[PDB]
Design a protein around this ligand. Structure first.
Ligand code: HEM
Ligand SMILES: *[C@@H]1O[C@H](CO)[C@@H](O)[C@H](O)[C@H]1NC(C)=O
Ligand SMILES: *[C@@H]1O[C@H](CO)[C@@H](O)[C@H](O)[C@H]1NC(C)=O
Ligand SMILES: [Ca+2]
Length: 595
């Protein structure tokens, strides 16, 4: 009657009340409402979902149905007209390393996932969708516009399948359609350890009772670990080189192998854990397997919290930083720590920070190997270039010494993503992350640009001139009003990202507001925030305050020259210093004083 809850699946909850550890599923973080910010629950709605039929069907589903008296443009057309660009000269960010981009993706992956409906098993309908392009129940294919190069070479559509939703897939969902966040809303390193108990356990070395995360027994990197392989056929990392047959890696997050540098940063994180559990043993030889695991896990979740909040968020938000994320004042139980649906789009700003090439560098930071730099597209689901060529060390140097793409109103998303994206089970390097993002906004029943501007106490343009004034771009504004007719209809993703960057930051005001609230909320609503009184000891927190991405590299690679500030643009050797000048993590406070 009153729709107390829609979650018939995943009822299991036992809250140990005295537990000194987060759960894997993020359940029992909040006490009054223990499901808040836990994996497998619905994404939060900061505003009501806007659907065609006000329930589930996305805007753009039915031809003859309008938003506010206008038809929504095609995703791919918005992509072609606005998002795409030819010229890769000039696009690089003078003050952000490629690591800047990377960490965004890491943090994102920790926070949210809304995977597709997994409905087409023992069912051709996931291919019926693919090659026939027939708009089905959860098949929502992206149609090419009439002047599109991809029409000529690669069919009539790009395939797409709607995201999963609570109260399973087959019947009408109670009330409106809400999408699942399949990972924990907390900045908890879930991408390393998993969000379900199954993965969590399968990821660990339970054979050695020293609380280590299971590593690879088939290949090594100069005596340092790799992630174990996920042997589940088909493997898209196998698919891309059939000769190499190197499968995708296995991590606490499914998407670890989407691209080589994410797999790389996943590899650093795993290593730091092992490195932390091996030490904990020395200082505490009496600790059991799980105590070593659990106690290293909290150090790592804390590490991710510090890098993100101290180093990453200030250079994303800049001026807006303090307006949205005031300095810490302790856990508030009344905060909603759940990731909002809109955040999983706000944080796609990263898509425009991704450049068209990745480099491998040697100890001199020179082109390592003849084919040193490679097109980004050849690196989707590519694990073999880690195993068979060079390890992670040369890649990590690229992340330091190269630049992120700067976002640009005339150059938004590289073709490497716009036209050449690889998606599992779809064979071709031929897709568009931009088009996909736009279709996803609709899929998810997103309110439009102006709804979100209103929500953030910013103005809502109605005219081309209004929009021009907001975007500070006559032409961009013009192209958007030609497509969307009204700014009320501009898809949040393209609308938020169109806004010029606030001072000393990399997003506009709307995104700064959206991101800001979310990252404010996940800090304040988290009972195990590293800096929450009680989580760590005073002695521990002064040891923790010293963590640095610089250090994580030194500890977990053979790289002995790093910058002080890894997110700034840093050039070798001018801004590089030895690993001996950089603060280690002192693990002495973790020694238990027994008798
Ligand atoms: C080469 C780099 C990257 C690739 C290839 C990539 C690719 C993708 C793909 C395929 C999706 C799924 C889209 C969908 O089905 O709706 C996605 C989602 C997403 N990406 Fe990226 N991405 C990259 C970098 C980044 C960066 C740097 C960020 C953030 C700074 C980011 C943030 C996101 C977020 C927040 C989502 C939504 C995740 C969810 O809730 O499901 N990505 N990306
Ligand atoms: C596949 O990998 C082998 C090394 O394993 C390499 O020499 C070859 O270039 C790769 N082929 C393609 C098409 O990626
Ligand atoms: C806790 O959160 C609420 C709403 O989320 C906020 O208005 C209030 O100021 C906070 N209270 C404390 C004790 O900080
Ligand atoms: Ca998480």
């Amino acid at each position: 009657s009153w729709e107390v809850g829609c979650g018939a699946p995943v009822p299991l909850v036992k809250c140990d009340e005295n537990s000194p550890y987060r759960t894997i599923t993020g359940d029992c973080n909040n006490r009054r409402s223990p499901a808040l910010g836990a994996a497998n629950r619905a994404l939060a709605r900061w505003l009501p979902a806007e659907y065609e039929d006000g329930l589930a069907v996305p805007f753009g589903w039915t031809q003859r149905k309008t938003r506010n008296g206008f038809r929504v443009p095609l995703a791919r057309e918005v992509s072609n007209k606005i998002v795409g660009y030819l010229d890769e000269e000039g696009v690089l960010d003078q003050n952000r390393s490629l690591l800047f981009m990377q960490w965004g993706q890491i943090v994102d992956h920790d926070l949210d996932f809304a995977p597709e409906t997994e409905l087409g098993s023992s069912e051709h309908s996931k291919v019926q969708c693919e090659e026939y392009c027939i708009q089905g129940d959860n098949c929502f294919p992206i149609m090419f516009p009439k002047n599109d190069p991809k029409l000529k070479t690669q069919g009539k559509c790009m395939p797409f399948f709607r995201a999963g939703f609570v109260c399973p897939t087959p019947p009408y969902q109670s009330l409106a359609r809400d999408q699942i966040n399949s990972v924990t809303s907390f900045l908890d390193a879930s991408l390393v350890y998993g969000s379900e108990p199954s993965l969590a356990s399968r990821l660990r070395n339970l054979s050695s009772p020293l609380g280590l995360m299971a590593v690879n027994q088939e290949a090594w990197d100069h005596g340092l670990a790799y992630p174990p392989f996920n042997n589940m056929k088909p493997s898209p990392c196998e698919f891309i080189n059939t000769t190499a047959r190197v499968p995708c890696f296995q991590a606490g997050d499914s998407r670890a192998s989407e691209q080589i540098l994410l797999a790389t940063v996943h590899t650093l994180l795993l290593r730091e854990h092992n490195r932390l559990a091996r030490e904990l043993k020395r200082l505490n030889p009496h600790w059991d397997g799980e105590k070593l695991y659990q106690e290293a896990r909290k150090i790592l979740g804390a590490f991710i919290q510090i890098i993100t909040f101290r180093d990453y968020l200030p250079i994303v938000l800049g001026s807006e930083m303090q307006k949205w994320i005031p300095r810490y004042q302790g856990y508030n139980n009344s905060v909603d720590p759940r990731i909002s649906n809109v955040f999983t789009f706000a944080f796609r700003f990263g898509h425009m920070e991704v450049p068209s090439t990745v480099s491998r560098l040697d100890e001199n930071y020179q082109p390592r190997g003849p084919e040193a730099e490679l097109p980004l597209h050849t690196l989707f689901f590519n694990t073999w270039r880690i195993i068979k060529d060079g390890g992670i060390d040369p890649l990590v140097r690229g992340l330091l010494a190269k630049k992120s793409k700067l976002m640009n109103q005339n150059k938004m998303v590289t073709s490497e993503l716009r036209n050449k994206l690889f998606q599992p089970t779809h064979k071709i390097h031929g897709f568009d992350l931009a088009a996909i993002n736009l279709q996803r906004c609709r899929d998810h029943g997103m309110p439009g640009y102006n709804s979100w501007r209103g929500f953030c106490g910013l103005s809502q343009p109605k005219t081309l001139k209004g929009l021009q004034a907001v975007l500070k771009n006559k032409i961009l504004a013009k192209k958007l009003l030609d497509l969307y007719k009204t700014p009320d209809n501009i898809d949040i993703w393209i609308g938020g990202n169109a806004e010029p960057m606030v001072e000393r930051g990399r997003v506009g005001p709307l995104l700064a507001c959206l991101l800001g609230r979310q990252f404010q909320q996940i800090r304040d609503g988290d009972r195990f925030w590293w800096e929450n009184p009680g989580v760590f000891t005073e002695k521990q927190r002064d040891s923790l305050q010293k963590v640095s991405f610089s250090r994580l590299i030194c500890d977990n690679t053979h790289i002995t020259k790093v910058p002080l500030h890894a997110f700034q643009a840093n050039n070798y050797p001018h801004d590089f210093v030895d690993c001996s000048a950089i603060d280690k993590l002192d693990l002495s406070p973790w020694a238990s004083r027994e008798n």
